């Protein structure tokens, strides 16, 4: 039934893109690793942090009225 959000996700990566990265956390729900949205460090490259098979730590940073879940990827 649905989550709550301010808990911490697991986000697996289940899809990246050229503008960035997406990703999943199963259960009906999935995060987003964009461009924009890796690490401190300059992720030019978003197939670089992001792997078909990479499972990463993030944070439920909150989800607008778009049901966008904003996943916030910890430092993996």
Same mark, same amino acid.
């Given at each position: =039934?649905?989550?709550?959000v301010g808990r911490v996700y697991t986000?697996?990566? !289940? *899809?990246? %893109? /050229? @503008?960035? =990265? @997406?990703? =999943?956390?199963? &259960? &009906?729900?999935? &995060?987003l690793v964009h461009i924009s949205q890796? =690490?401190?460090?300059?992720?030019?490259? $978003? !197939?670089?942090?992001?792997?078909?098979?990479?499972? $990463?730590?993030?944070?439920? #940073?909150? %989800? /607008?009225?778009? &049901? *966008?879940? *904003? #996943?916030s990827i910890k430092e993996a």
């Open positions: =039934a649905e989550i709550e986000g697996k990566v !289940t *899809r990246i %893109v /050229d @503008f960035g =990265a @997406f990703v =999943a956390i199963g &259960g &009906g729900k999935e &995060g890796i =690490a401190d460090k300059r992720v030019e490259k $978003v !197939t670089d942090y992001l792997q078909m098979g990479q499972e $990463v730590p993030v944070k439920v #940073l909150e %989800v /607008d009225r778009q &049901g *966008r879940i *904003r #996943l």
